[PDB]
């Protein structure tokens, strides 16, 4: 699957109608993927990562900032996997962060599953590969919170999608605008106005 | 405030891309809203209900049976509430059936609590018995309020989702009493509403 | 067995957890806290699926009491449904010390009684007595709470905690219909006992 | 501020039996020390005590990696919470390091920051840590580590926000390691002598 399909006309959701901090009232226009929408996808996206990798021990690997939260939560839904079953694939975390250089020899031959909020151009992404391949991995896979439509994209594929999004700024569920929009549970789409107020 | 309101159009999910019993496989056609959201409209609706309702005792009523998971979601929202606020209000429960010990409720705030209103039949007259036993306050929250030609005219005070005139089921709304074991709510399939038909 | 809470088990201050604000001058401590309670029946929902997870279970809830323990472990054992190598068709009822009616729709079948806390037993007793008058295949019996009580037959299939003959409250056990909002099971205090008391 | 939940040194814990656990780490434990979900009902409570202190301006929260993950984003889950339950609420940004230093630190400026650490044991690496941060002026900072041990090499370094305060014993799980193992644990637990044995460095 290329993940939960989201259209570009999809309304999304009036921020009236969910619960959200009180400082991103004009911030914000609408709500895109509820937090709750994000936890059953990324359930799903636990049991196919459990599928087709447990298997063996993994190596998760976190890319800070944004995948922090992703990160998190599918963890914790294979950690719910391996708590439950005959299938416990043993697994080690891992953080890297990338401003498009790195902030590594344990992944010589292993398995190592890349954990990322969002593909765009898919530049951060092959910069990521080429220096995890280099450290020679017994085998490497991606999951992605969100993979953006877009004519930018060189067109590399995560093996794993939560969601294939619109080319629209979305914030929220570790996703940023200038460090804000972190502290909120939704994904949501930047006003006009928050743009302009975060504006670094 | 309506709800979040669904459109007669919208194809709900894949259920590929969700987690759904195997019992279940064949017999559903969509997800149709995602346990998830169901929770996070929940969320704001309990805070809304606090609003109302709050300042003095809730009796929360739960309507049997496609109203108790609502009805559990929504009162743990509440007591997440209650508990990290500075003042915060005693609250009891009850239960009630409607097939087709009440002075509790005399004084009371009474929040009656439903899985969906169609005609609204069934919750004009709850109200009509309640009402008798002079609660202070009324309110109802249902889960899900159905566009349909055949309703009344009645409209809760806190409605979760509004949704078109399609049968739906999970989130302990049942056919024939099946797919209360299931946390989305989906559209029931015809290889599947002949399957459990009665 | 279940989680043995020793006699002399202090518990955890109030001041360390979140307790509603209406209900602090009511408890002495937190006997058991809420995510005890969940962690072990996520556990309880992998024996229940163990045992009877190879047929059509019926889960019977005794409200009122029994109401979160049913939510929870219903939920937990959902959890299992969708994720696990194991999928068991669940259908509910709900009865009170009646209750539903129908209660036929358990013959041939797996039943489950949920129940909050077995203290003499003699609310065990009638519930296994009743369901037995409709020829089930198997009845099982889940409870939360188990006394360390003196009081004279069945032993429970499935138990979360056992503990002393304490009066606790919470997790929807009350005292006077009160503290059934509260999400930790804690032991009241002796003003607890003086402002709700009968 | 309070010592948090006070567990004693001859704190059984509870039978491995009990509870759901990765099948891959079973003969690996002894006994399960602190339930995931007493680690959350702390957790929320620590939430509170942590906006009541810290809630009027601008909170960076600091992740101290690696073990201190889990209970980071737990706690500002229940921040989170309060935040959008509430009509006041001041906006929170994070940021992550590892101890050398790894991993721009200049948004902890003029903020409250609130650092979130998984267990402080000799308080040599706390101690340390601040001695970083402090000299990217904040306007004030604040320690919460979920675990604090008792131990005759403390140090005296004491954080404002303590989870549990243990016994001298070597726990893992909840992102706690022992050679990089356990992290992917719920619970927090004691390892047994065969998991020891298996795992040292
Ligand atoms: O809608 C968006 N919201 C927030 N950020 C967005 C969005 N689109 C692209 N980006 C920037 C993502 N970029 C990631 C940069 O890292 C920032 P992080 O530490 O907050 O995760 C690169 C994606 P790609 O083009 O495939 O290399
Ligand atoms: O789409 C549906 N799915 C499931 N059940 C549906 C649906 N529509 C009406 N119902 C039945 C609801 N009717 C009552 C059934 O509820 C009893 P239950 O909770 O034991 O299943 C009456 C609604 P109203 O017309 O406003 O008085
Ligand atoms: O500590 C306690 N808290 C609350 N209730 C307690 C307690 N101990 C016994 N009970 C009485 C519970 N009984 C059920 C409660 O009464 C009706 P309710 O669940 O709707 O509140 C059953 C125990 P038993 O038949 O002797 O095995
Ligand atoms: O019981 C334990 N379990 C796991 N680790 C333990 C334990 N006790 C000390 N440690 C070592 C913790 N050290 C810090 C953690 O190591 C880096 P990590 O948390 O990213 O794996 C020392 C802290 P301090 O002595 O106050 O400078
Ligand atoms: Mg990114
Ligand atoms: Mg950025
Ligand atoms: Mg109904
Ligand atoms: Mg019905
Ligand atoms: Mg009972
Ligand atoms: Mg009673
Ligand atoms: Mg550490
Ligand atoms: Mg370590």
Same mark, same amino acid.
Do not use: W
């Given at each position: 699957?290329?993940?939960?399909?989201?259209?570009?006309?999809?309304?999304?959701?009036?921020?009236?109608?969910?619960?959200?901090?009180?400082?991103?009232?004009?911030?914000?226009?609408?709500?895109?993927?509820?937090?709750?929408?994000?936890?059953?996808? *990324?359930?799903?996206? #636990?049991?196919?990562?459990?599928?087709?990798?447990?298997?063996?021990?993994?190596? #998760?690997?976190?890319?800070?900032?944004?995948?922090?939260?992703?990160?998190?939560?599918?963890?914790?839904?294979?950690?719910?996997?391996?708590?439950?079953?005959?299938?416990?694939?043993?697994? *080690?975390?891992?953080?890297?962060?990338?401003?498009? /250089?790195?902030?590594?020899? *344990?992944?010589? $031959?292993?398995?190592?599953?890349?954990?990322?909020?969002?593909?765009?151009?898919?530049?951060?992404?092959?910069?990521?590969?080429?220096?995890?391949?280099?450290?020679?991995?017994?085998?490497?896979?991606?999951?992605?919170?969100?993979? /953006?439509?877009?004519?930018?994209?060189? $067109?590399?594929?995560?093996?794993?999608? $939560?969601?294939?999004?619109?080319?629209?700024?979305?914030?929220?569920?570790?996703?940023?605008?200038?460090?804000?929009?972190?502290?909120?549970?939704?994904?949501?789409?930047?006003?006009? *106005?928050?743009?302009?107020?975060?504006?670094?």
């Amino acid at each position: 699957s290329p993940g939960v399909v989201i259209s570009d006309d999809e309304p999304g959701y009036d921020l009236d109608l969910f619960c959200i901090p009180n400082h991103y009232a004009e911030d914000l226009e609408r709500v895109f993927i509820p937090h709750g929408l994000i936890m059953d996808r *990324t359930e799903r996206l #636990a049991r196919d990562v459990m599928k087709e990798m447990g298997g063996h021990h993994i190596v #998760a690997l976190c890319v800070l900032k944004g995948g922090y939260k992703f990160f998190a939560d599918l963890l914790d839904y294979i950690k719910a996997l391996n708590r439950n079953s005959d299938r416990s694939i043993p697994m *080690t975390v891992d953080f890297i962060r990338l401003k498009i /250089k790195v902030i590594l020899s *344990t992944l010589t $031959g292993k398995n190592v599953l890349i954990v990322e909020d969002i593909i765009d151009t898919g530049k951060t992404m092959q910069t990521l590969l080429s220096l995890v391949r280099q450290y020679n991995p017994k085998m490497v896979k991606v999951a992605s919170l969100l993979v /953006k439509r877009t004519p930018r994209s060189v $067109g590399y594929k995560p093996d794993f999608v $939560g969601f294939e999004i619109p080319d629209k700024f979305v914030v929220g569920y570790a996703l940023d605008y200038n460090e804000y929009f972190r502290d909120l549970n939704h994904v949501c789409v930047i006003s006009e *106005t928050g743009k302009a107020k975060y504006k670094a």
